[PDB]
Write a protein that binds this ligand. Structure first.
Ligand code: CO
Length: 258
């Protein structure tokens, strides 16, 4: 049926409509820190978000997306394992019903409360729709969230969520600075993988930061008040919208640090 994260249409069902779900480079994965190889040939990441133009926030029935103007090189990711320039198109989170789960990637099987995905597309391909058809089409920056002190830069997001409680609702969301969601260190792990939602295309260079950000219990509880359903349908809280770890298969995770 229409895919989601429930008992009958969750991740274990996706392969029936999207056979690539059992592919050779699916995401997310467990990051075994002892096994990842330090790769001194790797460059530092270049995150250049100073001219980012946020536009809107949308509840799409799976998560909420903060969308950006990607019609110019305003907010880009370069360097690290990447060739060329990748433009920020949107960010979103995955989170749990409880603080013990919610992330998609895991680190030595540790699950974080949530995971932020900053999604960027390779410019060489002109638009997002074309980029997802290419093995180097997307670069997604993954950042773990743990529960502890509040993240000041996240509060503007948390506060608009009650205006987009249900599927299909959107709201204006301008002048948001995504630099306020980054941890101090840009040390990372990287590997080739996929989108973690249908259509699960194998088009992503994943860059997962080692350092988590902290958010407060109150901030994540507001995430969990969102809904998967549309307005005036039975309430299904938007929680546990994460895909579990997939087989690593023939892939190597590289580390940018020692
Ligand atoms: Co995601």
């Amino acid at each position: 049926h229409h895919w989601g994260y429930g008992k009958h249409n969750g991740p274990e069902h996706w392969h029936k409509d999207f056979p690539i779900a059992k592919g050779e480079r699916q995401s997310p994965v467990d990051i075994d820190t002892h096994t990842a190889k330090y790769d001194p040939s790797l460059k530092p990441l270049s995150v250049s978000y100073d001219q980012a133009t946020s536009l809107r926030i949308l509840n799409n029935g799976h998560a909420f997306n903060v969308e950006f103007d990607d019609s110019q090189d305003k907010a880009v990711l370069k360097g690290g394992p990447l060739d060329g320039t990748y433009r920020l198109i949107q960010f979103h989170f995955h989170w749990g019903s409880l603080d013990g789960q919610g992330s998609e990637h895991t680190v030595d099987k540790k699950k974080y409360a949530a995971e932020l995905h900053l999604v960027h597309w390779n410019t060489k391909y002109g638009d997002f729709g074309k980029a997802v058809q290419q093995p180097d089409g997307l670069a997604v920056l993954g950042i773990f969230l743990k529960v502890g002190s509040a993240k000041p830069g996240l509060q503007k997001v948390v506060d608009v969520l009650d205006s987009i409680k249900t599927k299909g609702k959107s709201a204006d969301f301008t002048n948001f600075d995504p630099r306020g969601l980054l941890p101090e260190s840009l040390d990372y792990w990287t590997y080739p993988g996929s989108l973690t939602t249908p259509p699960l295309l194998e088009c992503v260079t994943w860059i997962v930061l080692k350092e988590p950000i902290s958010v407060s219990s109150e901030q994540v509880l507001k995430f969990r008040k969102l809904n998967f359903n549309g307005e005036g349908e039975p309430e299904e809280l938007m929680v546990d919208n994460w895909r579990p770890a997939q087989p690593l298969k023939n892939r190597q995770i590289k580390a940018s640090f020692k």
